[PDB]
Every structure is written in C-alpha cells, then in structure tokens.
Amino acid sequence: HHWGYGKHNGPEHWHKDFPIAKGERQSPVDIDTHTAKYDPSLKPLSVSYDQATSLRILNNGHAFNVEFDDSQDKAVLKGGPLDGTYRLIQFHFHWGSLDGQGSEHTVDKKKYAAELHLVHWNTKYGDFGKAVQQPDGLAVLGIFLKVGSAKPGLQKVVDVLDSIKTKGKSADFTNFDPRGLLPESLDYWTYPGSLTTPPLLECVTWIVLKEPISVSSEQVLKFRKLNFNGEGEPEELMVDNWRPAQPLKNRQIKASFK
Ligand SMILES: CCCCNC(=O)c1ccc(Cl)c(S(N)(=O)=O)c1
Ligand code: NA
Ligand SMILES: [Zn+2]
C-alpha cells in the first residue's frame, strides 16, 4: 500500500507516511498574480542547456522521468533568485485526465493541462541525494502546458512512450535537447517550497515561468496512454498524477516582472 494518486493512496493520504506533507513550505501553491511582489533585484534566469546529455527515460509508476548525465557542469541553471549553480538531473511532467486539469501550480486558480518540472541540484552539495537534505538543495523550473499547437521539441519524448508503457520500463534516450521545451520568455515567479511527490522534502527553490508552452491534443493524449501499473498487471491509466495546491502559510511569492 504505497503512495500514489488514487482514492486510497493519493495526496490526502500522504501525510501518514510523510508527515512533512502538512509542513510549513509545501508545494505546489496557487500563484495569486496580484499579490505576488515584483522584486526588481531579481536577476534574469540563466538556463545553459547547450551541453545537456540525456541518458534514459523511465516509467517510475508515477510519471516518466528523462534523466541526464549530471556528473559534470553541463546543463545548469543559475541567476534568477539563486545563489550559485544548479545542475539538471531529470525532467518529468504532471498531467490530467482532461485538458482542464493537470498542473500542480495554479495561476489565479487556473489549472493548466500539464506542468513540466526540470529538476536541478545545487552543486555545493555534491550530488542530488545530499542536496535534497538541504533547504536550498534543489531548484525546479516549472513550465505550464496548454493544449493548442504542437510543441515540435516534445515529439521525441511522446514517440518513445509506447516503449515505456508500464511501471519499471526504461529505454535509452540520448541526444534529447531540453531547450526545445522552453517558451520564449523566461519571466518567472519564485518561492521556497518542497518536492510535490513523496518524500515531500522542503528543499526546493521553485521558479515557475509565466509563459506556458503549447502542446497538441495528440501529444497530451499520448501521455494519457501510459500506465501506473506494471506489465502483466491490470491497467490503470497514468492520468491525474498531480498534487493540488497547498497552503501558502508564511510565504511570499516574488515576480521577476511587471
Ligand atoms: C520518489 C520519486 C517519485 C517521483 N518524483 C520525482 O521523481 C521527483 C523528484 C524531484 C522533484 Cl523536485 C520532483 S517535483 N515534482 O519536481 O517536486 C519530483
Ligand atoms: Na488538436
Ligand atoms: Zn514534478
């Protein structure tokens, strides 16, 4: 009886195994755009993904992760609200059963069809597992997806999904360029929060881009053909793998713009 996204093991249950679920800096949150504070001292985000080396794509039973070689200073995020350098380790998505839901963060209560998370760890802690134990261990770049025109740089991901349909499947997945997943603008909101999945550790500086990317109906439909179950087990479509907005508590969301 492990955590997941259903009635009996979904987000409202996670606190029993992971009591930090009711902690002081949980994610995601609703971004109230009128109360976010513009901070003119915030710097442009620096996304340096030219030398990224993707390795593999994995269905972990909760989402799919595209993993990168994080053993050198390739694929780094810096600037913005961050001190120092954070290295890309993986990205994944959260999405809905329907186009009207799927994102984890919300914007003035609006839900997007999906949300991309590019996960980075602070190089001062040497590796991801030590970084998650620190309050400034991770930086996650969150990007909303709306359904409209296709995102051509997403198609390589969608096309490999058939090979990782069920929990535990993985495939070689080299030469994927995550630049093709970014919107034009790097304007962002930022706040201190947590992993949105167990173990829910309170180690993340969230950087949420204001501009969504568009993906096609066909592209998101292929995400919804994945399975939470393993091969040879009864089919449970991988949909609605998002945690709802959590209390803001004693936090301020800052804007890099307007
Ligand atoms: C036990 C791994 C379960 C799947 N969750 C993940 O792989 C995962 C890892 C790190 C982060 Cl920062 C996040 S998120 N959603 O970006 O907060 C998710
Ligand atoms: Na369409
Ligand atoms: Zn995530």
Coordinates of N, CA, C and O in Angstrom, one line a residue, residues 7 26 32 41 47 56 64-65 102-104 110 115 117 121-122 139 142 146 173 184 191 208 210 219 231 238 241:
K7 N -7.8 7.2 -4.8 CA -8.7 7.5 -3.6 C -8.0 7.0 -2.3 O -8.2 7.7 -1.3
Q26 N 5.2 23.6 1.9 CA 4.9 22.6 0.9 C 4.5 23.2 -0.5 O 4.0 24.3 -0.6
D32 N -1.2 33.7 -6.7 CA -2.1 34.8 -6.9 C -1.3 36.0 -7.5 O -0.4 36.6 -6.9
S41 N 15.2 43.5 -7.7 CA 16.5 42.9 -7.5 C 16.7 41.5 -8.1 O 17.8 41.0 -8.2
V47 N 19.7 29.9 -18.1 CA 19.5 28.5 -18.5 C 20.5 28.1 -19.5 O 20.5 28.6 -20.6
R56 N 18.4 8.4 -20.4 CA 17.4 7.3 -20.4 C 16.1 8.0 -20.1 O 16.1 9.1 -19.6
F64 N 6.9 9.8 -16.0 CA 8.1 9.3 -16.7 C 9.2 10.4 -16.4 O 8.9 11.6 -16.6
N65 N 10.4 9.9 -16.2 CA 11.5 10.8 -16.0 C 12.5 10.7 -17.1 O 12.9 9.6 -17.4
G102 N -4.5 19.2 -14.5 CA -3.2 18.5 -14.7 C -2.0 19.2 -14.1 O -1.1 18.6 -13.6
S103 N -2.0 20.6 -14.1 CA -1.0 21.3 -13.5 C -1.0 21.2 -11.9 O -2.1 20.9 -11.3
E104 N 0.2 21.4 -11.3 CA 0.3 21.3 -9.9 C 0.2 22.8 -9.3 O -0.7 23.1 -8.6
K110 N -6.4 29.2 -12.0 CA -6.4 28.5 -13.3 C -5.5 27.2 -13.2 O -4.3 27.3 -12.8
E115 N 2.1 20.2 -16.4 CA 3.2 21.0 -15.9 C 4.5 20.2 -16.0 O 4.5 19.1 -15.6
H117 N 8.4 19.8 -15.0 CA 9.4 20.1 -13.9 C 10.8 19.7 -14.4 O 11.0 18.5 -14.6
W121 N 20.0 20.2 -9.0 CA 20.5 20.2 -7.6 C 21.7 21.2 -7.5 O 22.5 21.4 -8.4
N122 N 21.8 21.7 -6.3 CA 22.9 22.7 -6.0 C 24.3 22.0 -5.9 O 24.5 21.2 -5.1
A139 N 16.6 23.4 -7.3 CA 15.9 24.4 -8.0 C 15.1 23.7 -9.0 O 15.6 22.9 -9.8
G142 N 9.6 25.2 -13.4 CA 8.2 24.7 -13.7 C 7.7 25.5 -14.9 O 7.8 26.7 -14.9
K146 N -0.4 24.2 -22.1 CA -1.8 24.3 -22.6 C -1.9 23.6 -23.9 O -0.9 23.3 -24.6
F173 N 17.7 7.0 -24.2 CA 17.1 8.2 -24.6 C 18.1 9.3 -24.6 O 18.2 10.1 -23.7
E184 N 9.2 31.3 -25.0 CA 10.1 32.4 -25.4 C 10.6 33.2 -24.2 O 11.8 33.5 -24.2
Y191 N 9.3 31.1 -5.2 CA 9.0 31.0 -3.8 C 9.7 29.7 -3.3 O 10.1 28.8 -4.0
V208 N 8.8 29.3 -11.4 CA 7.6 29.0 -12.3 C 7.6 30.0 -13.4 O 7.3 31.2 -13.1
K210 N 6.0 32.3 -16.3 CA 4.7 32.9 -16.6 C 4.2 32.4 -17.9 O 3.0 32.2 -18.0
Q219 N -0.4 15.1 -28.6 CA 0.7 14.9 -27.7 C 0.3 14.6 -26.3 O 0.8 13.6 -25.7
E231 N 3.7 -4.2 -16.1 CA 3.4 -5.2 -17.2 C 2.8 -6.4 -16.5 O 3.2 -6.8 -15.4
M238 N -2.2 6.2 -16.5 CA -1.4 7.3 -15.8 C -2.0 8.6 -16.2 O -1.6 9.2 -17.2
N241 N -1.9 12.7 -12.2 CA -0.7 12.5 -11.3 C -0.2 13.8 -10.8 O 1.0 14.1 -10.8

